[PDB]
Design a protein around this ligand. Sequence first.
Ligand SMILES: OC[C@H]1O[C@H](O[C@H]2[C@H](O)[C@@H](O)[C@@H](O[C@H]3[C@H](O)[C@@H](O)[C@H](O[C@H]4[C@H](O)[C@@H](O)[C@@H](O[C@H]5[C@H](O)[C@@H](O)[C@@H](O[C@H]6[C@H](O)[C@@H](O)[C@@H](O[C@H]7[C@H](O)[C@@H](O)[C@H](O)O[C@@H]7CO)O[C@@H]6CO)O[C@@H]5CO)O[C@@H]4CO)O[C@@H]3CO)O[C@@H]2CO)[C@H](O)[C@@H](O)[C@@H]1O
Ligand SMILES: OC[C@H]1O[C@H](O[C@H]2[C@H](O)[C@@H](O)[C@@H](O[C@H]3[C@H](O)[C@@H](O)[C@@H](O[C@H]4[C@H](O)[C@@H](O)[C@H](O[C@H]5[C@H](O)[C@@H](O)[C@H](O)O[C@@H]5CO)O[C@@H]4CO)O[C@@H]3CO)O[C@@H]2CO)[C@H](O)[C@@H](O)[C@@H]1O
Ligand SMILES: OC[C@H]1O[C@H](O[C@H]2[C@H](O)[C@@H](O)[C@@H](O[C@H]3[C@H](O)[C@@H](O)[C@@H](O[C@H]4[C@H](O)[C@@H](O)[C@H](O[C@H]5[C@H](O)[C@@H](O)[C@H](O)O[C@@H]5CO)O[C@@H]4CO)O[C@@H]3CO)O[C@@H]2CO)[C@H](O)[C@@H](O)[C@@H]1O
Ligand code: CA
Ligand code: CA
Ligand code: CA
Length: 404
Amino acid sequence: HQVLFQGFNWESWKQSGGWYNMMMGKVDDIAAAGVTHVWLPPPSHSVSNEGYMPGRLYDIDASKYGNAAELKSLIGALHGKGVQAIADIVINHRCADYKDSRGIYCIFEGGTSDGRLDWGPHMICRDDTKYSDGTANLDTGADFAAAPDIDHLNDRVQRELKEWLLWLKSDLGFDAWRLAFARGYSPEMAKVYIDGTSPSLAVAEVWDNMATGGDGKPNYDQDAHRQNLVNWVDKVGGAASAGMVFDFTTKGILNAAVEGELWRLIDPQGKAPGVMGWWPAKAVTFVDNHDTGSTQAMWPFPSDKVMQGYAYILTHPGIPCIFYDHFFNWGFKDQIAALVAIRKRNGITATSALKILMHEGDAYVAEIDGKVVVKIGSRYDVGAVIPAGFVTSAHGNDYAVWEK
Ligand SMILES: OC[C@H]1O[C@H](O[C@H]2[C@H](O)[C@@H](O)[C@@H](O[C@H]3[C@H](O)[C@@H](O)[C@H](O[C@H]4[C@H](O)[C@@H](O)[C@@H](O[C@H]5[C@H](O)[C@@H](O)[C@@H](O[C@H]6[C@H](O)[C@@H](O)[C@@H](O[C@H]7[C@H](O)[C@@H](O)[C@H](O)O[C@@H]7CO)O[C@@H]6CO)O[C@@H]5CO)O[C@@H]4CO)O[C@@H]3CO)O[C@@H]2CO)[C@H](O)[C@@H](O)[C@@H]1O
Ligand SMILES: OC[C@H]1O[C@H](O[C@H]2[C@H](O)[C@@H](O)[C@@H](O[C@H]3[C@H](O)[C@@H](O)[C@@H](O[C@H]4[C@H](O)[C@@H](O)[C@H](O[C@H]5[C@H](O)[C@@H](O)[C@H](O)O[C@@H]5CO)O[C@@H]4CO)O[C@@H]3CO)O[C@@H]2CO)[C@H](O)[C@@H](O)[C@@H]1O
Ligand SMILES: OC[C@H]1O[C@H](O[C@H]2[C@H](O)[C@@H](O)[C@@H](O[C@H]3[C@H](O)[C@@H](O)[C@@H](O[C@H]4[C@H](O)[C@@H](O)[C@H](O[C@H]5[C@H](O)[C@@H](O)[C@H](O)O[C@@H]5CO)O[C@@H]4CO)O[C@@H]3CO)O[C@@H]2CO)[C@H](O)[C@@H](O)[C@@H]1O
Ligand SMILES: [Ca+2]
Ligand SMILES: [Ca+2]
Ligand SMILES: [Ca+2]
C-alpha cells in the first residue's frame, strides 16, 4: 500500500505560528486517511519565502516554515503514526550570501561554523556566466535563470551535498526525497545523490512541455512525453534505483480528458496513456500541486471535476499523491478518505493490473485487479458494462466505485 500527500501549498509560509506547528494538528487525520508518505517543503534558509532559492542549507532555523526543533517534532509525530516524511530537495541552483571582489554574489555559506558548503564561484557551472568565474565544469543539465547553477561534476560539491542529505535523515528524520527541477542536472548526477543516500524513494520533478495540436489541445499520442520520463528512470538505475518520476503525462492528458474527452484515457495497446501505463511502479500520479494549482495556477485541473481526478488516480496503478487543499479546503475530505480505504482494503498497489471496460467521450469505466470497478464521466448510466457480482460502494459527482 502506498499513497503520497503534498503537505503544503504556495501560501504555507505565511501561516500564523508556523506551518509545521499548524501541521501537528493534521497528522492524525492524514494518517487515518491511509496516507503513507508526506512531502514537506524545502527546509533550509532561502532568499525566496517559499524555499526554492536555497542559501545556507544547514540553517533550518532560518526557514519561514519553522525551525529544526519544530520540523523534528512534526516528523516525529508523522513517524509515530507510521507515516514517512519526504523532503523537497533543491540542488540545481543555490544563492550565495556574499559578494566577491567583482561585486557578484558567488561566495556561499553553509550555515555552520566550519567550511562545509562554504563554496565560491569555482562551484558554479562555468557556462552560467552571470555568476561563474569560468573555472568550473559545464552544467550537466538546464539552467535556472534566477540563481547560480551548481557544478555537480565537482568532487567537493558531490561530497558535501551527500553529507548534507545524510544529515537531513539522521538529524531531522527525513526518509525520502522529492528532486526539484531535476532536468537542471543529468540523471547520471541524480544517480550519485540517490545511490549515495539510500532514500526510501526519490521522486523527480521532470517537467517537460506537452506536444499540442493546431487547436491548442494536447495530442492524443503522448508517447514522446512519457518516453522522456521513462528515459530518466532508466538512466538513474531503473528497477535497481530508488528513483521515480511525477507522472506529468497523466496530469496533462487527464486535464483535457475530463472535458468530455474520456476517449483520451487509453492508448492503442489498451494501456493507460501516461507513465502509469508503461512503468507504474515508477509513476507518481497527481491531480494538482503547488505550481499547477494553488495560488500559482500554472495548469489547474478543471475545478468542477476535481473528484473525477481522484476517483481516477486513487483506484488506478501508479503511486497517487493527494494535494493538501483538495483534502482539507475543498469539502472533499470524506470522499477522498473513502477512496483510499477502497484502494487499501482491496490490496491495490502501484503494480495492480488494469483492464479498461469503456473509454468513450463521456464515460470511462475500468476494472482493477478484478476487485474494483471505477467510472468517471457525465454519462449517468453505465449499468450494462458493470460485471456481475459488483455493487456500488462510493460515489459522487460524475464518479462511482463498485466492489465484489
Ligand atoms: O532582504 C530579504 C532577503 O535578504 C537576504 O537576501 C540576499 C541574498 O542572500 C543574496 O544572495 C542576494 O540575493 C541575490 C540572489 O543570490 C540571486 O539569486 C537573486 O536572484 C533574483 C533573480 O534574479 C530574480 O529573477 C528573482 O527571482 C524570481 C524569479 O525570476 C521568478 O521566476 C520566480 O521564480 C520562482 C517560480 O516562479 C516558482 O514557480 C518556484 O519555482 C520552483 C517550483 O515551485 C518547484 O516546484 C520546482 O521544483 O522548482 C522551481 C524552481 O527551480 O520558485 C521560483 C524561485 O523562488 O520568483 C523568483 C523570486 O523568488 O529574485 C531573485 C532574488 O531576489 O538576486 C539577488 C540579488 O540581490 O541579496 C539578497 C538581498 O540583499 C537574505 O539572505 C534573505 O534571507 C532575505 O529574504
Ligand atoms: O518481461 C521480461 C523482460 O524482462 C526484462 O525487462 C525488464 C527491464 O530489464 C527493466 O528495465 C524494466 O523495463 C523498463 C524499461 O527499461 C523502460 O524503458 C520502460 O519500457 C517502456 C519503453 O520505454 C517504451 O518505449 C515501450 O514502448 C515500446 C514498446 O515496448 C515496443 O514494443 C515498441 O517497439 O516501441 C514502443 C515505443 O514506441 O514500453 C515499455 C514498457 O512496456 O519500462 C520498462 C518497465 O515497464 O522492466 C522490464 C520488465 O520487468 C528484460 O530486459 C526483457 O528482455 C524481458 O522481456
Ligand atoms: O444496480 C442496480 C441499479 O442500477 C441503476 O443505477 C446505477 C446506474 O445505472 C449506474 O450507472 C451507477 O450510477 C452512478 C453514476 O454513473 C455516477 O456518475 C454517480 O452518479 C451521481 C451523478 O453524477 C450525480 O449527478 C447524481 O445526481 C443526480 C441524481 O442522482 C438524480 O437522482 C437526479 O435526477 O439528478 C441528479 C443530478 O443529475 O448523483 C449520483 C450519485 O452520486 O453515481 C451513480 C451511483 O449512485 O450506479 C447506479 C447504482 O448502482 C438503476 O437506476 C437503479 O435503480 C438500480 O438499483
Ligand atoms: Ca560555514
Ligand atoms: Ca543559473
Ligand atoms: Ca543546472
